[PDB]
């Protein structure tokens, strides 16, 4: 149908809010920005049904029900209206057509490798390209009209204060968090670029032509070649003996290449020089490069799924219904396949759930999964565009919790540690990724005060934070 989220100016937005939600007063009593939240939901009855879940999916279902219940009312309404207003949609979708037409390098480096990124972790350039695109998208469409909706330029949170009773769990969340992001990409227990470098150290010049990680000179998320850091890790684990064996592989390869007639002679000098370079500099957090910009990726996704300004309201409505009850990737994928809208099947085709075998935390932020539909819900699912008055019932998506206050008694931390215990007691094997309590907490520690803020330009390491307790006076 039609998009009834329509207004001109900041004054227009406020009048739109008054008309559409006439019998409610938006409240910051528990949130950073006006919301429907009037009480901290109770969740510890979910704790018990977590223990007695049997199958994988019913484990997921219990945590998802808790997550929905906790975040049902916390969304910052004005920010949501802005994100899915008739004018924002039109401008937001249009931006991508422009990068295509202008062949924008920063946009294309990851976009037209979408297929590869469903399987492989991204390079540095592909991460930076994305992050630069998010910032430029936000500028182009004028997204930062609200404090809720801003680009952040600051430092991660150095001290996080919680009620004394929460301190223990919060600290083990930081440990858990630290252990997850101590990457990079792992197939088994070990790091892959390392095991490929051992493969190189043993001869096996084949590991040089086609590295496990892709291109020989590929740079990791911190701008360093995998081959360089790989050779570093070897000298550390398997001592300086492992380093002489690497040089032997270098020499064996150089000798092989001149004697060989098959591989191209330019590529021989590429591999050899890059390998010698890596050996050389083997002996040796300004931003958040892997940060998902929820808003920009959600817009990329619905552009990729063929959403038009016209079709947008049915998507919004679909997401709004998702937000009403627990979700399930199996049931989601059936729902999407059995409603037959033009965008339905192209959206499903984007999912990476079955193709990304590594930890999801290593996947490029522009890559969609059934899990990452909770990102789209923040943008277009809190307010159903064709019947906006229905938002008064609320709509629960994970990162709504980013809008919950961390001051006073810290309702946010209370909600977070309750979600963390439910998730831990579900004892699930699934990669909760973008709705796991530790990912959520990490967003908070980076300093996000809603989900609509971009925190790429935030300096420092969020897991370094000091957890500080306070008691009642």
Describe this structure in words.
- This protein has 473 residues and is mostly helical.
- The protein folds into two domains: 9-179 and 289-470, no CATH class; 185-219 and 223-281, Methane Monooxygenase Hydroxylase, Chain G, domain 1 (Up-down Bundle), CATH 1.20.58.
- Helix content is 50%, strand content 2%.
- The protein is built from 21 helices and two strands.
- It has helices spanning 9-20, 44-51, 56-71, 77-83, 86-102, 105-111, 114-117, 124-141, 167-181, 192-201, 206-209, 226-237, 239-259, 265-281, 294-304, 312-322, 329-337, 344-348, 373-380, 411-426, 437-446; strands at residues 159-163, 466-470.
- A two-stranded parallel ribbon has the order 1-2.
- The radius of gyration is 24 Å and the shape is globular.
- The protein starts with 8 loop residues before the first helix and ends with a strand.
- It is found in: Virion.
Query: What is the radius of gyration?
Result: 24 Å
Residue share in β-strands:
under 5%
Overall tally of domains? 2
For the secondary structure, the number of strands is: 2
Q: Helix share of residues?
A: 40-55%
Structural shape: globular
Strand order in the largest sheet? 1-2
Provide a count of the helices. Answer: 21
Largest sheet: 2 strands, parallel
Q: Helix and strand string, N-terminal first?
A: HHHHHHHHEHHHHHHHHHHHHHE
Structural class: mainly alpha
N-C termini distance: 55 Å
Features:
monomer, 473 residues, mainly alpha, Methane Monooxygenase Hydroxylase, Chain G, domain 1, 2 domains, two-stranded parallel ribbon, 21 helices
